[PDB]
Structures are given as C-alpha cells and as structure tokens.
Amino acid sequence: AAPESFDEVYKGRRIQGRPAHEHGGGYEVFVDGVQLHVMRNADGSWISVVSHYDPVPTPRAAARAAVDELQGAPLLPF
Amino acid sequence: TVRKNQATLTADEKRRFVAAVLELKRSGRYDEFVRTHNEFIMSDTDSGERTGHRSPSFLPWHRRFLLDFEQALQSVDSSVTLPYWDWSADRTVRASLWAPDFLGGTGRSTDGRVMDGPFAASTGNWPINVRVDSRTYLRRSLGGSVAELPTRAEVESVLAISAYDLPPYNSASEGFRNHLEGWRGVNLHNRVHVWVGGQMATGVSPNDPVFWLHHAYVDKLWAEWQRRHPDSAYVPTGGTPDVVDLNETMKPWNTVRPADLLDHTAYYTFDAL
Ligand SMILES: [Cu+2]
Ligand SMILES: [Cu+2]
Numbered sequence: 481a482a483p484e485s486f487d488e489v490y491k492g493r494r495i496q497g498r499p500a501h502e503h504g505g506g507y508e509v510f511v512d513g514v515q516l517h518v519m520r521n522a523d524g525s526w527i528s529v530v531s532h533y534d535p536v537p538t539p540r541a542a543a544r545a546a547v548d549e550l551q552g553a554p555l556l557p558f
Numbered sequence: 559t560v561r562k563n564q565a566t567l568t569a570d571e572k573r574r575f576v577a578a579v580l581e582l583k584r585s586g587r588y589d590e591f592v593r594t595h596n597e598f599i600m601s602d603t604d605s606g607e608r609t610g611h612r613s614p615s616f617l618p619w620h621r622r623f624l625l626d627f628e629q630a631l632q633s634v635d636s637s638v639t640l641p642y643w644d645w646s647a648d649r650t651v652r653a654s655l656w657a658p659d660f661l662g663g664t665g666r667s668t669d670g671r672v673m674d675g676p677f678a679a680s681t682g683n684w685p686i687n688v689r690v691d692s693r694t695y696l697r698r699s700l701g702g703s704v705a706e707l708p709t710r711a712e713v714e715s716v717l718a719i720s721a722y723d724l725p726p727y728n729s730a731s732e733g734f735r736n737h738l739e740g741w742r743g744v745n746l747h748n749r750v751h752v753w754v755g756g757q758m759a760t761g762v763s764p765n766d767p768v769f770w771l772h773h774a775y776v777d778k779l780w781a782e783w784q785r786r787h788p789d790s791a792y793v794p795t796g797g798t799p800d801v802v803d804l805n806e807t808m809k810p811w812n813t814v815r816p817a818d819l820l821d822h823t824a825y826y827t828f829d830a831l
Contacts, residue, residue: 502600517690517761521612521741522604522730529600529690529761533740533751534703549759551669553691558600 482507486540492552495543502558509543514555518542529558559628559826561778564641564655564771565648566829572660575641576676578634579767580683587630592688592764594810595623599761604728607800609809614723614735614793615802617780618819620773622811625825627770639826642774645750646710651700661768663700670697670756677767686757686765696766697756704752712744717783722793727801734783738776747776781822781831792816 482499489495496510502517509516509528517529518539525535530546546555567575582588598610598619610619628640648655656663662675672695677684679695686694721733729741740748750772751758757765764770795804802808804816 501597503603503606517600519600519603522726522728529596531759532599532761532763533748533759535741550691553693555691556689558690 483539486543488540490544491547493547495540495547497539497543507539509539509546511543511546511550511555514557516543516546516555517558530555559639560829561639561774561826562641562829564643564660565653567641567660569659571638571641574635575631575638576660578631578638580676581634582630583684589688591623591627591630592762595764596688596762598809599763604726604730608728609802611739612729612741613801614727615808615816616735616739617777618792618816619802619808621777621780621819621822622808622814624770624773624777628826640770640774642778642828643768643771644775645707645753645772646713649707649709655768655771656700661766662696663698665696665698665756669693669695670699672696672698672756686762688762688765689757690760690762698758698766699755701753702755703759704749707753708744708746708749713746713779715744716746717779717786719783720787720790722783722790724793727794727798738779738783746779747772777822778828778831781828784820785831792820 485498487496493512498508500506500508503519507518509518519527521535525537526539526542527535528542528546530549536542536545602608602610602612604612609615624640631638643655651664655661658674662672662677665672672678677696684696686696716737719734719737723735724731724733737743738746740746751763754768757763758769792804794801802816807813807815
C-alpha cells in the first residue's frame with residue numbers, strides 16, 4: 481500500500497505528497513510545486529535527493545528534511 | 559600508482575592535487591563526474607535495477623569510478639594520485655584535511671557556506687553547477703547532523719563479517735557490503751556523508767572534493783576485508799535479476815565487470831595495507 485497523500489505549509493513552504501536517469505517512483509513529493517525526487521528503502525524508510533544518506537520514516541518527513549536542508553532556497557527541477 | 563593517506567601528503571603533493579582538481583573543474587570535466595554519480599544515486603532502487611550503490615556492485619562500481627577520476631587527474635598532472643581519508647583516525651574538524659591549504663573547513667552557521675580553502679565560493683574557482691536547488695556555493699556542516707564519525711573499533715566489527723553480501727542484495731542485506739555502505743548496523747559510509755553535511759549529504763555529493771577521499775578509504779576497506787577473508791569473494795555469481803553478478807558488465811562503462819576490479823593491485827597499491 482502506498483502512503484497517504486499530504487499537503488501542509490512547513491517552515492513557510494508548501495510541501496505536498498501523493499501516490500503516483502531517475503527511478504520510477506511510486507510516490508511524488510513537491511516543494512512549492514517543484515518535484516523533489518524521493519525514494520523508499522526496503523525497510524519502509526524514505527530518503528530524497530536533498531538528503532540521501534539519512535533515512536526518515538515517511539515521505540512527509542523526507543519533504544520536511546528537504547525544506548530544513550534548503551534553508552529557503554528554491555528547489556530546481558531534476 | 560600509490561594511494562596515500564591524505565594526512566601524510568607533503569605540501570607539494572597537496573598543492574598539485576588541488577590544482578589538478580581545480581583544472582578538471584575549469585575544463586568542465588569535473589561536473590560530468592557529479593552528473594554520472596547523481597544519475598545512479600537516483601535510479602538504483604532496492605526493488606529494481608541497482609548498480610552503483612545499495613547493491614553488491616557498490617564497491618567495484620566505485621572502484622572503477624574512482625579510477626576514471628584518478629586517470630582524469632593524471633591527464634592534468636601525471637604525479638597526482640587519489641589520497642584517502644581515514645575518518646576513523648582523522649576524526650575532528652581540526653584535522654589537517656580541513657585546513658585552508660587542503661579542502662578548507664566547515665561552513666558558516668547561517669547558510670552552510672564554506673569560507674576558506676581552494677574550494678570556497680569566494681575564490682571564483684568552484685561553482686556548484688550540477689545541483690538540486692538554486693544555491694551555487696560549496697556547503698558543509700562538519701559534525702552537524704550526526705555527532706561522530708565511525709571509530710576504528712566499529713570499522714573492525716564490519717571488517718570481521720565473512721560474507722561479502724547476501725540476498726536480497728540491497729539495503730536490507732546482512733553481510734559486509736551493506737554494513738560498510740551503512741544501511742544496516744553501526745553505519746560507516748552513509749554516516750560519513752551525513753557527518754560532512756552540505757552537498758556531501760545530498761544526491762550530488764561529488765560536488766565536494768572530499769567525496770573522492772572518502773570513497774578511496776571505503777575502497778581501501780574493501781581491500782582490507784579481502785586480506786581478512788581470502789576465502790570469501792564477490793557474490794552473486796550468476797543469474798540474479800536487477801543485480802550485477804560477478805561476470806556481468808556494469809553501466810555506464812559496459813566493458814568492465816566486478817571480476818575485473820576485485821584485485822586493486824592491478825591498478826594501484828596503498829601506502830600500507
Ligand atoms: Cu558515497
Ligand atoms: Cu589465514
């Protein structure tokens with residue numbers, strides 16, 4: 481089963497998640513409407529191209545870690 | 559070709575290494591290494607095709623990727639070889655590695671920007687071009703997201719593991735490869751990426767020149783594992799969907815197999831092994 485979708489404003493940025501040279505991702509995340517590449521690991525944790533080496537439990541947690549890392553910078557399309 | 563511990567380089571060797579790296583960057587060659595790495599980081603998956611990491615070929619793939627990079631450095635200055643960073647020994651922000659004559663230090667607290675050394679954005683010599691966000695400056699936060707680098711004792715606990723890799727040959731595996739990569743256990747390679755922070759913690763991690771030194775030490779640990787376990791070898795050995803078996807070729811090169819890369823001494827030796 482895919483995780484549920486989400487939509488919130490986190491640290492002033494809109495983060496959204498939804499079930500759907502880069503893999504064919506079963507789930508999509510956006511930060512202010514720009515897609516963030518995310519990936520699920522076998523144990524159910526998530527990572528993203530902004531924070532690839534530090535797994536977090538959910539795609540919303542990956543979106544929030546990306547906003548934390550970006551420190552206000554716009555994401556670029558991948 | 560001798561790969562030497564970074565800590566041991568002379569002033570002249572540090573100067574020549576930095577100059578060769580900066581010339582690869584100037585000429586445009588450096589950024590295509592960053593782009594190739596990113597393409598595999600984002601495409602390898604635990605449930606499908608996987609080559610450059612989360613998989614048994616993590617080690618031979620990086621051994622060939624690092625040989626491609628070293629050969630490019632040698633095309634600029636034939637005296638330069640890739641040094642390695644023993645993060646179990648050189649484990650603080652005060653290490654010589656992070657001095658202004660070598661890689662520069664940590665980033666400032668406001669935006670993570672590295673402010674000193676040859677790779678600082680202010681030099682004009684290290685634009686971050688292959689990137690996932692607008693920021694074009696090298697960033698680091700040494701020790702920011704995780705408190706400590708691995709210790710020698712932790713490294714030994716991984717070197718003691720006899721199986722090279724195990725089914726399902728991905729981030730859930732037991733065995734040496736996945737414990738050195740760090741998805742399970744005390745965590746060696748992934749934790750170093752998290753510890754450096756900045757671009758090293760992202761899917762464009764070769765943007766920091768420390769990438770190469772980190773992976774040259776991971777490559778050395780594979781060599782040490784081999785000497786610990788002369789009876790153990792690369793697996794799988796044939797017929798495994800989505801995974802590079804011993805005698806299958808690896809993308810992107812297509813002309814080399816794990817088997818061609820098991821013996822590093824065909825290409826270089828270490829200062830000590
Ligand atoms: Cu790595
Ligand atoms: Cu023996």
